Design a binder for this molecule. Sequence first.
Ligand code: AHG
Ligand code: AHG
Ligand code: AHG
Ligand code: AHG
Ligand code: MG
Ligand code: MG
Ligand code: MG
Ligand code: MG
Lengths: 312, 314, 312, 314
Amino acid sequence: DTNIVTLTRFVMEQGRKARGTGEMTQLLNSLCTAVKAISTAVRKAGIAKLDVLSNDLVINVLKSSFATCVLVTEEDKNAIIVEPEKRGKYVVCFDPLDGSSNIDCLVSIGTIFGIYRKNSTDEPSEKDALQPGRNLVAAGYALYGSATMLVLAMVNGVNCFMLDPAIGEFILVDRNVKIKKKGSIYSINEGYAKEFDPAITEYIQRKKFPPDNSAPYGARYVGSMVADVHRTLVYGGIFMYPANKKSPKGKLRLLYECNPMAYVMEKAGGLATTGKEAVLDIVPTDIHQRAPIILGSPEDVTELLEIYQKHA
Amino acid sequence: AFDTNIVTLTRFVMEQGRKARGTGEMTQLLNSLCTAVKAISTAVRKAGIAKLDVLSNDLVINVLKSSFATCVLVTEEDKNAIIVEPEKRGKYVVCFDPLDGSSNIDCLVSIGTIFGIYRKNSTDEPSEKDALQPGRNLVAAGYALYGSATMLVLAMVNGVNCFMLDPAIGEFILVDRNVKIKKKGSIYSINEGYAKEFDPAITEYIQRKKFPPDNSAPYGARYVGSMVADVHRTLVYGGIFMYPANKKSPKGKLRLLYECNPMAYVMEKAGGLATTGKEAVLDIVPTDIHQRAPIILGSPEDVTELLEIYQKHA
Amino acid sequence: DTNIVTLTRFVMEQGRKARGTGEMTQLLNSLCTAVKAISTAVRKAGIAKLDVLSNDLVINVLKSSFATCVLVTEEDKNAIIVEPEKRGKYVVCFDPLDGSSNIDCLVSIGTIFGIYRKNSTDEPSEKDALQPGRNLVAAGYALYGSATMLVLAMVNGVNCFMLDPAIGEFILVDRNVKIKKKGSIYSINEGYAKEFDPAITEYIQRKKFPPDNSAPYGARYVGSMVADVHRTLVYGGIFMYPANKKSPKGKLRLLYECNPMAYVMEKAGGLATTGKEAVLDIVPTDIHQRAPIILGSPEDVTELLEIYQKHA
Amino acid sequence: AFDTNIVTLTRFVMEQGRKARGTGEMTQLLNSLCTAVKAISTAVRKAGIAKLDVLSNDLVINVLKSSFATCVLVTEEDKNAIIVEPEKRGKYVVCFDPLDGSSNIDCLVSIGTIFGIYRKNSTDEPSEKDALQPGRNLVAAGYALYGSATMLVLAMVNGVNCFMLDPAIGEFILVDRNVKIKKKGSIYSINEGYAKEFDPAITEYIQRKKFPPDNSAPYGARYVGSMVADVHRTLVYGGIFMYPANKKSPKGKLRLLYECNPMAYVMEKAGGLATTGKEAVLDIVPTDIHQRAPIILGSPEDVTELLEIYQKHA
Ligand SMILES: O=P(O)(O)OC[C@@H]1O[C@H](COP(=O)(O)O)[C@@H](O)[C@@H]1O
Ligand SMILES: O=P(O)(O)OC[C@@H]1O[C@H](COP(=O)(O)O)[C@@H](O)[C@@H]1O
Ligand SMILES: O=P(O)(O)OC[C@@H]1O[C@H](COP(=O)(O)O)[C@@H](O)[C@@H]1O
Ligand SMILES: O=P(O)(O)OC[C@@H]1O[C@H](COP(=O)(O)O)[C@@H](O)[C@@H]1O
Ligand SMILES: [Mg+2]
Ligand SMILES: [Mg+2]
Ligand SMILES: [Mg+2]
Ligand SMILES: [Mg+2]
């Protein structure tokens, strides 16, 4: 296409409307180099650990962007502070490859990222990262499956870009993704059925055997959060990884799995809660803390929230 | 970097047929299918920037006819069997589903091409009767998975070998030789949204997986919603995949000739079982080319565990 | 490679040292999208004019960069003035695909570009483009052959970047290309032998039948300027498209063939002359004017210049 | 977009051999060479980010042996002919230059793989004598050009057909069928740096091209410096390519079996001539596998014009 709207062109025209300095546009450009290199890695991870390579890649592209200052990783015990010479205004919380272990089974996987603005005047620190997802200025994920898709939520909307592997560019294919109000699928690991707390268990039963003599929901569960959430966004439904006695505080980490997705969901008109509060309004105390998460089409998450407080 | 001794699928099937006194035909047929799979991998990968199953159908059909190795072809997109024109005939029957789950591309779930090849057992004019052979008589069967990578998994008389598309040279490269499934698995795959209508055998097996009597950890649940996806997962990691019958689909959903039987043959050659609940899928005699069948496949002990539950429920 | 120096990372670190605004870095990034799309086009221009597509591509990526204001093309009669809303500080003179007609024969071909800074305060105009190549702030070419190579000359040096088609990125492979002083090849279309002016003709004879009983020069001539010049830069030699009675003012255009190459050559320690003056010191009056050009390793161009004024 | 009726090289050679009662061998051999060409195209394209001719040699040799279609192989990188082991033998002789002009990669000039395939004419044990056949006895011959695109040009008994690598599906696609060269050309290709030592026949032809007696426009000069480059140019656009002898290379530079003869056979099947100046290259009897020969090929009238100059100079 002769005037292809690339992710660069898209982000660039939006930063220009803020009368900014281009650090966002630098950032997402670097992150895109990481994403292409990792898609290429996963498309041949078989012909002859991987998440370590993936991680050193994302840190390097992000430091060299001259746009970050604190970086928090799935893979790193502490926050990494960008050297003064390369420091810039943003904080990035990211998981470089959620569920790497799934590549043997060829399950679609992805990089999840969340970006905050450091607001304080003192030295870069983990505190800058300990912010509520409600204050993210941008977020999204790149999914490596049949095709590589980068979905990006900013103040203006949720947009989806596809990698064109010929020209090595992410091209804009869906503008202002809005989720369906009510959907027909429920995504959850039912093999934890005995560990679930009452509200979930009533809702599972309500969807399988619908009290209103309507259609039972379809069950789906890829087993990798990006695959499941992306399907929930494009098709509608509910996705849950609730607390259970094995994972009492949930399992997905708040700063780099839950808050990114929750932000993408809510920006598309979806909702995202823990059962007791909005995921995005949780204030983190540890950069690696977990959350219960339930997200998806609005009426569905709500139906569940009623069962939660018709049980409180 | 740049390997000199590359084992491509063509080189490996060639080293099979040659020692068994091949004719050059299996390889002609298979190299044709590989072009079709490459061509479908790419369009799927650019799907959203560019029906795809109709085009796939036409493609798979044209590359197959041109192999000079086919005579009858069955497709899920074609009512009647296609009999290849005389000039291009050869001895095999290829039953195939060109693009499994094509509904799911929008949500970027891995989908696949499934195929079964029979050898014609008659001195006659090709007709769809030649396709109506049971699973046990398959010469080769396999699938192509369009996922984070493109995997072709061929199962033929000695075993199952996985291949992966090297997108640089455009070749399927041998990555796993002589595969064998785990014996006992830890994953069960079934659409529990249909839970209100399952037969009581299934209903107990699922609850046994969830709430184990003998205080084991429950089995995990996984269900991508694309048969190829869930089968490959079942083959590499083990477990059990169940698409049993429910009254709303009274004799199952999955079609016997080009979906159930290819998977059943790939499973059994890896040491798994594939049954409908009553009999081995591979011994059902096909009566209509688009006939349907319930299928349960997976790790031998898990299949068997569900069978004992079926036996005590009859 | 986990910390790949991409053309973006290279240009970005250099603009940062000027305390600039990033328009250069925007520019070369957009130009790179054009170059990848055209390499992809040429790598299948056969499976089933092209230079028209190539041109609309380069103009579009360049306007959307918010970094240009006058664009001069091989293919356009007049200079194109960037709309106010997308205007920026640079001028780009470019040939989107020198020798397109050579793709039938599979001769390596390329995009040549030259960038000036508009220095005046008045409205953008062709005058801003009518500058001497000596004042280019950057220049180079992308070559589409066996591999796609972008060679870029800036105030700091000549560097060569190769496109890695897996990750869709130009990677830095040669830093500070310096040309050889004296080389062993002479590149010229000898089928014009009767049309050549005396100095050339003495020099051709001196290289074939060397008076010092030394080795005769090897002749080479691909027939596409980028192929020939790139070889001259990497291997050393002399390349000439002199004036001849068919082409009395030369044939290559000054603003988008000769001045870019001349600038790349001189920045690598090469020289580039018309026989009477340095190509880069010529002051253009028409944006589509031609020049005689003779460029290559220094001692060789000089040897020829002595024959020119041992004939003046 | 996404074509359903893709004519790949495998499909086209298959439609040749089948009507002529093939054995499945030419196609086995050729599909092997295509993998080698794909693998060499990519490494060349990433050459500067990554000897390449040694690896190419090994690659071409392993893919060829595995075709079950070869018995003797001659390479410019190997002194003696390689005789394929018994298990993998078949009827053909492939003489090949794995990476012509590999010196030139640094300067990013298009280079190529050249190959000739003979059919063994003896009931004997394979030996390099089987390779010492003259050009006229070639069954198929061609080249692969690694340029702005990857072009494979196969010449076989009926004509020459160009194919182009579609980097998406990784297949060589038929783009020009039944090629024929122009009869009179306008380009002569020769390294005039060697001008001090050419034989007087050449010296007049070049001056006739430059300074035409009959007041035509002079011929243009073009010389890439890679034989494949200049040959393909000569085939598609016409003209004459001359690598004659000079005393400093007294019997020419280009080796007869795997460079001169493949080009000579591709030229003649397109209606061009290839001579040394005295005789047609295709009738010289090879005596050493690495023997050399002068070659002049190109458009029939231009070749002939230089020959009349050779006849009146003897
Ligand atoms: O191992 P990661 O990188 O944390 O990702 C795995 C995650 O963990 C979930 C699977 O957990 P269960 O098997 O407990 O459902 C996936 O859906 C998520 O991607
Ligand atoms: O209809 P298709 O193209 O066969 O794809 C969907 C199929 O239907 C199954 C899932 O259906 P449910 O939603 O009934 O589980 C998949 O395993 C199969 O691929
Ligand atoms: O047609 P373009 O795009 O101007 O490019 C052709 C140029 O013209 C030269 C060829 O001219 P001659 O055949 O006169 O040497 C090439 O070297 C140059 O690339
Ligand atoms: O030595 P190679 O690998 O055969 O490559 C260079 C060869 O040598 C010829 C050019 O040599 P000159 O410099 O003598 O013209 C080319 O046509 C041939 O490819
Ligand atoms: Mg994770
Ligand atoms: Mg199907
Ligand atoms: Mg030009
Ligand atoms: Mg050679």
